[PDB]
Design a protein around this nucleic acid. Structure first.
Ligand SMILES: [Mg+2]
Ligand SMILES: [Mg+2]
Ligand SMILES: [Mg+2]
Ligand SMILES: [Mg+2]
Ligand SMILES: [Mg+2]
Ligand SMILES: [Mg+2]
Ligand SMILES: [Mg+2]
Ligand SMILES: [Mg+2]
Ligand SMILES: [Mg+2]
Ligand SMILES: [Mg+2]
Ligand SMILES: [Mg+2]
Ligand SMILES: [Mg+2]
Ligand SMILES: [Mg+2]
Ligand SMILES: [Mg+2]
Ligand SMILES: [Mg+2]
Ligand SMILES: [Mg+2]
Ligand SMILES: [Mg+2]
Ligand SMILES: [Mg+2]
Ligand SMILES: [Mg+2]
Ligand SMILES: [Mg+2]
Ligand SMILES: [Mg+2]
Lengths: 156, 60, 207, 74, 259
RNA sequence: AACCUGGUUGAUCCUGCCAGUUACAUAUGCUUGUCUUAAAUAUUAACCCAUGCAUGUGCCAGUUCAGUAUUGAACAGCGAAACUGCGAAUGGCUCAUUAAAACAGUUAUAGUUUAUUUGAUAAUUAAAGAUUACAUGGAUAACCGAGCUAAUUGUUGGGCUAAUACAUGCUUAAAAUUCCGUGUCCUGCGACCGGAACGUAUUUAUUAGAUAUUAGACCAAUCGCAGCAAUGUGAUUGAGAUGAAUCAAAGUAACUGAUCGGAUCGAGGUUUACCUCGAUAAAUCAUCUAAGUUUCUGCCCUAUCAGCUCUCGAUGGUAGUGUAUUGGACUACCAUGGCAGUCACGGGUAACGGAGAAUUAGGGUUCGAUUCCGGAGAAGGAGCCUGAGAAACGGCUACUACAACUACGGUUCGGCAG
RNA sequence: AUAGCGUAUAUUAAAGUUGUUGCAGUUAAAAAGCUCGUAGUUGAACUUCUGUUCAGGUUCAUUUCGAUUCGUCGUGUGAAACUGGACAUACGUUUGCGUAAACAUUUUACUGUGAAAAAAUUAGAGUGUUCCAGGCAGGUUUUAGCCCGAAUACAUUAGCAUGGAAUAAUGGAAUAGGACUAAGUCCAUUUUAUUGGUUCUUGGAUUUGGUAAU
């Protein structure tokens, strides 16, 4: 149980104070989870965590609609947000060969995930959460990268 | 004025403005088929050329 | 002439981002309604002031300028009554909002116990405003209507916080409406966890 | 029947067949009338409308009906 | 763009109308209605281009403003020159008692299918949505923008009802499963007709179904463009005469000109 | 038509350009006889404009004591004015701005708005007050009459009467459900009895949202239902939609009254107190129409641009606020991020993007102001009104720079990129 | 050349004088004074080879023939590269009626199909606008009619769907509870009208025996 902020943090659509639950001096005890039906398993942690994340796809009103992404986690530097990296080969018609291009997508991480820098992320499209972020983290795949995360180039 | 009628070009002009062999052949044509005006033979040339481009693409 | 367009900001890279079109009337934002508690204000003749606002699509939106009473729910009990709101105690956003007595969503306010005190007394036969002589039950035993009033009371135990507050006749409740939209202060009475919390916040501010 | 024919064919045709008349000069008049009309109020406006150069729809249906009344079946 | 667009230019009017490139600048912008703008065949085209009952604009007006009530769509009168007669509609001309059904041929232009009187009572409907309505009344919605109440509860979403336009009573229905007959409302496969082989659901976005015809050529198209024609191999509609089988231009030239 | 020729030497084989040749755009000079088509002040100056015109609209179906006509003694044909509607946000013009911007193809809206269309709904007209429903109330324009200005599509007083204008309000379901009674019986807060509340919508809170694409048994209590009764008796269709919802559709509290719940019109008539067709106003949900935002990917030259962004937003996190909605869009607090040699940031473009156009062995090269679709703008900036839609510009307000009248004090329906 | 034809300027071929295809660099203009080296570009060989049998076409040959005809058809027989069965330590289980699903197969680039796709253009079928540019029309006395058309291709990149064996990158069991299997221990857990205990399933983790060419 962690509350640190100006405002008390609790999930929407879940009432903490019902007459049975006031008998327990412990925070919460009834938790919101969900299925995002793309065949995405709702993580163990979404279920057993104390976390309030209003932008979590499992714990909240977040709807995942229309676009999915695989990528590399280059930077877990910010608050509940990572950046992901997609590398692709753009084809130049004339010289008749390709060219190595990359794109950086800011993704949102629900606290239910353990994310090492240089991991593999799946993210679903999302409503506009922030200025940069249209994507939310669905699945983390653990892996080991040697050297800096940047230099590592995976086209999958 | 907007108008949707299509563009045409019936003939073509040779890379080489003066070459005897060609000029002579063209005047033999103008002579025998009783034409006037070289472009008549040129537009015939154009037509034939179209036919041939067709056959070629089809032989691809 | 306020604008919600994103064009007036720097793109992610930091680059100054270009502008061809004008401000469009559809990107319009609107001036803020600082919505006030006229309850304790003595100089004020007009306590309730709400403005209709002609909005996109020809609809109405309702501006609370001045509010005094609002409609609040007691969650455990599922009991909702309209009462007068007393004071704005704590604001998570900004404290000058508490100083200006401004009403906003997830503001923290206090409420007159009174309607809830009475409903409780009616229902359970227990007056929460009183310290001693707490039970108001009728004289005929074995009368279904007094029996019920006991059967209710049998399972019930309140938080000390809710009791003490009820005695005080003022109650901590956080307000769930958007007074600059709906024109209402509607809210829920704080219980348990949220009460532990906002009491402590009020307490270390007070300490 | 020439009833229908008289109700369907448009007016320039009924002139080719001599039934109707001339379409007199409309535009110039109408637009100068538009001028004056816009620039005053009701009474005067009506006084201008009395003077309009139009060949009225009334008069059209009138000449049509009258010609339908002068007709003799073959 | 300052709000709504009230015009349509001839170059932009759908190929399915077969308008003349040179015929003008504008064409008739279909009216808001039961069918979308691109799936519309407006009345003015129905009369002027197709039936030739109207030679020009004035004429169309004459027909549709004549007190005599000349044109009918699904039994209901229409006086609007741009009324969007859409797919499966039954349009009927009172003076001749002509009863036509609006369809696409294999080449994706609009066709009037002549119907006898028994056909003209019936019209095919395709389920769009299914819900519980207010007061807890089950309801159903259709491609022609019908709302039908108290549907037979077995009716699922994306089925085809056979609808009695005299009685406004759904008669028989069939759903989208392997083995039923389809017509294809939109596609490069527009107008083709066939037996559903099976359906693959991709669940992110767009579900694709596969089809066969009498001759045995397979098709595929997204679920949205499938329209069910009845149970079995039998269709509940008289199809324009290709019978819904596409012809290779080789087949076309052969059969037509005897090559 | 996948071709080349002339010019360095005394001559020679080379490199290499110059020149010729070719097409195509503008321009131009000379010259022009039919017929069929036909671009056209883009380039320079998105420079400035006299004048004319380019946005209006009436059915039988909102208002007629104009007029006309010797009209059903309330009007009834034809038909002004003027209220009242609707439109004026499309179209047409121009390419100045604009280099991930706009645009294109692909997505999302479960993050929204939509006047007019099509389909379907609607028993309760909140409370207080008021309450005629064989139907409520007060005004105003046109009109008549008197004026002011040098001046305009300026308007001032005065006398009249309509509206689908502006106000107001009557319209008897049952059942179930919740609450209340110191009621009866009881012991299940259960039944009977009595009394309230009870449309929809608005605002919160809470209860359940049903799952048969699926598996069961041993103790307890099972709650019920046959049944007083011990005895059991199981439990099995009854409730949709999605990939997913905090969806639909519901229960219980209250809250608002600023939602809607027809005081409107025609026509044909069975001879007329009753039928049959319609017009229109409006709410909710679909539906059409269009828009706002939005996913992914893709632009020319430049390093005599290598670091960029962050004193008030730069990247993210929180509560708010605002909006039609999402969002640093905006505020308060917090964190130190975000982009960059895979070229960031910054210049340039005699740059609006496409669909396309000229050439083309193949590969390329070079254009696209200009028919179609996007985008932008109306002399320059900003700001608004009204609307369903506008930052409108053939709308208003202001400034900068200008255009037209003036009796000098004032005024303009002053804005050719129609 | 010809009712047209000069000239100027930008641009296209000429240009293999911008070069990916496709140029040059000892002396014609051109290899950096020289090493180290990050980005970038580039990367040695090995793994179900193979053989045997069946069928279907598709090609080929022709001292096999035929039939008719102005060239196709049928048939030989063998011969090919397929395509697909089949058994061989050999491109998979398991279930419901040749086709779905679920399970399992590390991902992709690449390639073949398909969906989604704006008309006008362009390529192109049909059609005598007197030809033609072009248009989308037309053709017929069976006339209160009839016949027929307004095709089709193309629609590059990126998204989408699906078939793939080569090639190229990347993966997997080297501190291994890795794999299979048996037996335990936990954490969850849909159904069994409901809450409680036991269980059951299932789905994760974990301990230990056994099996394997580890
Ligand atoms: Mg509205
Ligand atoms: Mg006329
Ligand atoms: Mg219309
Ligand atoms: Mg969807
Ligand atoms: Mg020399
Ligand atoms: Mg010499
Ligand atoms: Mg030269
Ligand atoms: Mg002549
Ligand atoms: Mg009028
Ligand atoms: Mg720039
Ligand atoms: Mg973008
Ligand atoms: Mg008066
Ligand atoms: Mg009762
Ligand atoms: Mg009558
Ligand atoms: Mg360009
Ligand atoms: Mg345009
Ligand atoms: Mg768009
Ligand atoms: Mg002009
Ligand atoms: Mg030298
Ligand atoms: Mg290798
Ligand atoms: Mg095998």
């Amino acid at each position: 149980d962690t509350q640190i902020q100006r405002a008390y943090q609790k999930q929407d659509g879940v009432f903490l104070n019902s007459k049975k639950l006031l008998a327990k001096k412990t925070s919460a005890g009834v938790r919101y989870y969900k299925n995002i039906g793309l065949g995405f398993k709702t993580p163990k942690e979404a279920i057993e965590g104390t976390y309030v994340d209003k932008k979590c796809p499992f714990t909240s009103n977040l709807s995942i609609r229309g676009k999915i992404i695989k990528g590399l986690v280059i930077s877990t530097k910010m608050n509940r947000t990572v950046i992901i990296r997609r590398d692709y080969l753009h084809y130049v018609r004339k010289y008749n060969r390709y060219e190595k291009r990359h794109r950086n997508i800011p993704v949102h991480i629900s606290p239910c995930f353990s994310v090492k820098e240089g991991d593999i992320l799946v993210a679903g499209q999302c409503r506009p959460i922030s200025k940069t972020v249209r994507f939310n983290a669905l699945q983390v795949v653990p892996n080991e990268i040697i050297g800096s995360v940047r230099k590592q180039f995976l086209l999958f | 004025g907007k108008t949707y009628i299509n563009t045409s070009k019936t003939y073509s002009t040779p890379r080489r403005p003066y070459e005897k062999e060609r000029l002579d052949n063209e005047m033999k044509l103008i002579g025998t088929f009783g034409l006037k005006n070289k472009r008549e033979v040129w537009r015939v040339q154009m037509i034939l050329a179209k036919f041939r481009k067709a056959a070629r693409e089809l032989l691809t | 002439g306020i604008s919600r367009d994103s064009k007036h900001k720097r793109r992610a890279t930091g680059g100054r981002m270009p502008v061809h079109r004008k401000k469009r009337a559809f990107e319009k934002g609107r001036p803020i309604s600082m919505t006030k508690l006229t309850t304790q204000s003595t100089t004020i003749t007009e306590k309730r002031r709400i403005r209709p606002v002609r909005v996109r699509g020809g609809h109405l939106k309702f501006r609370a300028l001045r509010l005094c009473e609002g409609n609040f729910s007691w969650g455990s009990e599922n009991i909702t009554r309209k009462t007068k709101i007393l004071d704005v105690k704590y604001n998570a956003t900004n404290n000058e909002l508490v100083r200006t007595k401004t009403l906003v969503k997830n503001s923290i306010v206090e409420i007159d116990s009174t309607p809830f005190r009475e409903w409780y007394k009616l229902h359970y036969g227990i007056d929460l405003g009183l310290k001693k002589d707490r039970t108001v039950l009728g004289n005929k035993e074995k009368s279904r209507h007094v029996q019920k009033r006991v059967k209710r009371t049998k399972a019930q135990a309140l938080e000390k916080n809710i009791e003490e507050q009820f005695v005080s006749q003022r109650i901590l409740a956080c307000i769930t409406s958007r007074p600059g939209q709906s024109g209402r202060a509607d809210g829920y009475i704080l219980e348990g966890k949220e009460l532990e919390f906002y009491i402590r916040k009020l307490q270390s501010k007070k300490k | 029947n020439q009833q229908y024919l008289l109700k369907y064919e448009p007016n320039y045709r009924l002139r080719k067949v001599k039934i109707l008349g001339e379409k007199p000069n409309t535009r110039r008049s109408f637009k100068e009338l538009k001028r004056k009309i816009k620039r005053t109020s009701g009474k005067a406006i009506t006084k201008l409308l009395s003077e309009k150069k139009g060949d009225t729809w009334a008069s059209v249906q009138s000449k049509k009906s009258d010609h339908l009344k002068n007709f003799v079946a073959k | 763009a300052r709000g709504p667009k009230k015009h349509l230019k001839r170059i932009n009017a759908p190929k399915s109308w077969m308008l003349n490139k040179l015929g003008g600048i504008w064409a008739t912008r279909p009216s808001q209605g039961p069918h979308k703008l691109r799936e519309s065949l407006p009345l003015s085209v129905l009369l002027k281009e197709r039936l030739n009952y109207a030679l020009n604009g004035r004429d169309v007006t004459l027909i549709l403003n004549d007190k005599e009530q000349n044109v009918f769509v699904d039994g209901k009168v229409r006086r609007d020159k741009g009324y969007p007669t859409g797919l499966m509609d039954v349009v009927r001309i009172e003076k001749t008692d002509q009863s036509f059904r609006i369809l696409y041929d294999t080449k994706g232009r609009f066709v009037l299918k002549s119907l006898s009187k028994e056909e003209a009572k019936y019209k095919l409907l395709k389920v769009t949505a299914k819900a519980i309505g207010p007061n807890q009344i089950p309801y159903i919605v259709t491609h022609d923008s019908r709302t039908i109440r108290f549907p037979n509860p077995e009716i699922k979403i994306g089925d085809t009802l056979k609808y009695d336009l005299v009685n406004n009573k759904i008669e028989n229905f069939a759903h989208l499963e392997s083995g039923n007959v389809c017509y294809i409302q939109q596609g490069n496969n527009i107008g083709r007709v066939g037996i559903i082989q099976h359906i693959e659901k991709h669940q992110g976005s767009f579900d694709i179904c596969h089809v066969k015809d009498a001759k045995g050529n397979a098709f595929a198209t997204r679920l949205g463009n499938i329209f069910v024609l009845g149970q079995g191999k039998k269709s509940w509609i008289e199809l324009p005469s290709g019978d819904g089988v596409r012809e290779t231009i080789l087949e076309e030239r052969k059969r037509k000109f005897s090559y």
